Design a protein around this nucleic acid. Sequence first.
RNA 1: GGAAUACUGCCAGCUGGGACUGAGGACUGCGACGUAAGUCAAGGAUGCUGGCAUAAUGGUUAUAUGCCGCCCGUCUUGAAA
RNA 2: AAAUAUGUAAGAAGUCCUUGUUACUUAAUUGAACGUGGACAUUUGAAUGAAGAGCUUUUAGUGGGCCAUUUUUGGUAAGC
Lengths: 159, 185, 171, 51, 222, 58
Amino acid sequence: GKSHGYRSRTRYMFQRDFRKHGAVHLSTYLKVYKVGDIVDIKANGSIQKGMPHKFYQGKTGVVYNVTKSSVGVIINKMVGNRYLEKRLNLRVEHIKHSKCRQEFLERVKANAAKRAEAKAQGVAVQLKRQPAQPRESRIVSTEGNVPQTLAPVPYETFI
Amino acid sequence: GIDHTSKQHKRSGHRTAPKSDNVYLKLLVKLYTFLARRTDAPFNKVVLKALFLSKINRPPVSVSRIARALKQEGAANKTVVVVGTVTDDARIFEFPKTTVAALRFTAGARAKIVKAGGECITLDQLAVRAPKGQNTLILRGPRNSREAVRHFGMGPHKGKAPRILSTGRKFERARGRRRSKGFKV
Amino acid sequence: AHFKEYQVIGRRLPTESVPEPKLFRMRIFASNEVIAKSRYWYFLQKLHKVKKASGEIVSINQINEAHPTKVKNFGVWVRYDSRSGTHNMYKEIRDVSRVAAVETLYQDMAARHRARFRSIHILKVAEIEKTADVKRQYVKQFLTKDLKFPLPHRVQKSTKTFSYKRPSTFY
Amino acid sequence: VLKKNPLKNKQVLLRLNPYAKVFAAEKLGSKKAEKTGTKPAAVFTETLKHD
Amino acid sequence: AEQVAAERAARKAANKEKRAIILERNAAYQKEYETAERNIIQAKRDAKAAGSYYVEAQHKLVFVVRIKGINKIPPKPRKVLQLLRLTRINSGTFVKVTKATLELLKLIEPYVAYGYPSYSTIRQLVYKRGFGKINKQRVPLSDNAIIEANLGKYGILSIDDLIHEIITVGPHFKQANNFLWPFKLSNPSGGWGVPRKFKHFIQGGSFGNREEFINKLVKSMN
Amino acid sequence: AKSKNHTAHNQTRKAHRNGIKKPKTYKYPSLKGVDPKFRRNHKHALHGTAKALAAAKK
RNA sequence: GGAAUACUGCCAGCUGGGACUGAGGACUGCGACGUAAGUCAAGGAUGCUGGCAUAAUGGUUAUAUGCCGCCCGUCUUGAAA
RNA sequence: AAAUAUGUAAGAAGUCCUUGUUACUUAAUUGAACGUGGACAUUUGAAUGAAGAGCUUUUAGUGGGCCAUUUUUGGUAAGC
Ligand SMILES: [Mg+2]
Ligand SMILES: [Mg+2]
Ligand SMILES: [Mg+2]
Ligand SMILES: [Mg+2]
Ligand SMILES: [Mg+2]
Ligand SMILES: [Mg+2]
Ligand SMILES: [Mg+2]
Ligand SMILES: [Mg+2]
Ligand SMILES: [Mg+2]
Ligand SMILES: [Mg+2]
Ligand SMILES: [Mg+2]
Ligand SMILES: [Mg+2]
Ligand SMILES: [Mg+2]
Ligand SMILES: [Mg+2]
Ligand SMILES: [Mg+2]
Ligand SMILES: [Mg+2]
Ligand SMILES: [Mg+2]
């Protein structure tokens, strides 16, 4: 018959790494999680307690609860045609801080500093990001760079 | 052909021109559609849309609700406006000297208001007193207090009132409702 | 189509590690400039590590024939793909311009080997400046002294459906 | 009630654009450019004519 | 209160002042257009004289025309066409060129013909098929007061102001381009020039980026 | 008589008819599943805060 | 060395022929030409003329001709079967 | 170790400054959470589009499917 257990099809997913087996380093336990932090979920196969289900591997959530060895995480899951919120109790070995939020935070800090320094001058702040613009005109010299002509090559066997 | 991004020929879904064929109500909506077209005050549009409403969307407003609304700071001399029925409440013992404009007053509500010394007013008298709705206070009754809304969204772990005729022991208090009989909900 | 020859010069995009890249040039036979730039990027991707996103085109210029009313003999070296493999061919074409020579080359390849434009590479085309270096008989027979030939069996095209006398094919 | 095309109907062209009258007056559609006698470099010509 | 002469004369005087403003603006636009084109031509000539190569700036503006019907479209290109407002065959829209819009065009390549529009075809498009979106209604432009009332916040007063904002991709290109209703072109008057539309232009078909030949196609379709 | 066993054909079209709307986010999400020791402290802290604010703006 | 011409493109350059349409129904708007009066091709056709005034146009109907058209209802993935 | 698909983020429910409550926590005004007052507004924080956005009740029919390009299993294969 068919087989859909809890860790079905998780062979390579919960495999450890190459040359990174063994005990986990102490920085994962020394990290501090507060309610509202944005975290990434990646299960550690050597820690069988407090594991996330295979659906949440590679998912990003928000902390809502802090306990002795674990963190409560909220994930939005697509079921049918809408999302439901799911509350996960994960040990901190399967959790790391997300870096997207902190990049946006440092952008906000630099943006506010730029706005504040330009507030005393009024110099058209230009605080929005822009996409990659089409490149402007340029002059390409041939001093030491006289153009070299290329031609297609004939067929050869090469074995 | 057009790659339509929205449904074609769909109605707005909002009730204009109320379903009632009460001729006095039609006169009232004629007056207030004139006022809402030509006075640019948001009060007239709000009360026109309220005049369109159905009965369950016009719950009665009690005189206790009116007194509680008049107890707000700076709202003591405002004209209370109820597009609907005003019922009274014997749970209050003192009532202020307000002016209340409404579609209908019960006998107890009208007696309570005129005994406290205020007055009961129809919406067209409200229109000639405050054409732009000056110094008015619109009150709405509780929509989600009906008996029918108890059953809306019935399901597991909802706490949402089974549709049932008889109540008591042995009417839906067994398997599915306690842990001793299978499971609880 | 009716071909034009273009020089296309392009390069890799400049970086801080290396400003002034090496400016590669090609001669492309193409119907228009859009196709010319597409073929430039195709062949440069065959040759060097670059593509359109990481490179740029600094120049494209049409090259006119220098003497478009002188009769030349061209040698053409071609790479092409058959249904079974890849082959090199040398052909030679008597014509008045390089673009006319490559047009009749593409016609001849499609006629004789069913080779389509996507299957042909022009390795090179070059004027054979001296006779007796012409090595194909089908063009060498036009290089004899005081050449003249008739045109037997002239077929004269009528404008009317009915003719009132038997036609003549004299010429 | 009816969309009259500019680029015909010079009346609606002059209604939309007052500059069209003086554009036609100085004939800016056919504007003669100033002649310049500059010549490309020998490196450009030999690169163009290179085999 | 005669009220048929006094405020009528005042309105006429205000109209003459607005027309004078539009006239001097259009003179300035024409002068800067011709200065830009002569400067580009002369820069190319000077680079050739110096022995260098003038690489002109990449195009900032494309015109995109839907070439395929509405049946049998995959969902991601269908969504991108809807977001570019090409919901009908022979519908056209101007697009500002950035990395984001370039990736959109790469998504919808086999259903559009696009390229770089010139001043003449932009002017003919806006003059002949020029419709503004005023409270979700498609209104023929036909007068400068419409453009005054709907785009006058961002300095745009006339149809040539709108044309200038489109061709020189200005700070309110997004607002002006969204104000313009999508252009409803016909089929081309001389045909498509190919036996078969749905190959790339490079392969002898019709879709993709024909760079400067979009002017010929759009003028035959307009 | 055999039949079709399973397919997900037409299912994403059905979901996308009036489908994949995002959940509503609110200020103050619910506190259920949070540590009961924390909640027990939190109720007393909020009661004391309410008394302090009432005495301040009495 | 000095031109010409091709090709490509632009003109708010000029001009001839053909076809289909004429919605709206006092005025109001934006313009153009004029010092002005006013005029105009400027928010949708008017002017001039002829024949007939009747089965002539037209309608209906039978027929002929060109091209097209399988039997309905039903179950069904699928019906002219 | 790709390509294609896939989670999150791109602000006012944000960021910073100062300091009240608690029976929690700490060696400890240490912290945690929730709080009072102030500052930063239209380039308020990428693009494009929005055709309105959000919410609810109730009920029909349906729950035999088949076909094409590409991915793909059994089978020599099949209009399997
Ligand atoms: Mg792994
Ligand atoms: Mg265990
Ligand atoms: Mg119309
Ligand atoms: Mg024709
Ligand atoms: Mg064809
Ligand atoms: Mg079934
Ligand atoms: Mg089974
Ligand atoms: Mg010409
Ligand atoms: Mg008859
Ligand atoms: Mg007849
Ligand atoms: Mg008849
Ligand atoms: Mg018959
Ligand atoms: Mg017949
Ligand atoms: Mg037949
Ligand atoms: Mg059957
Ligand atoms: Mg159902
Ligand atoms: Mg069912």
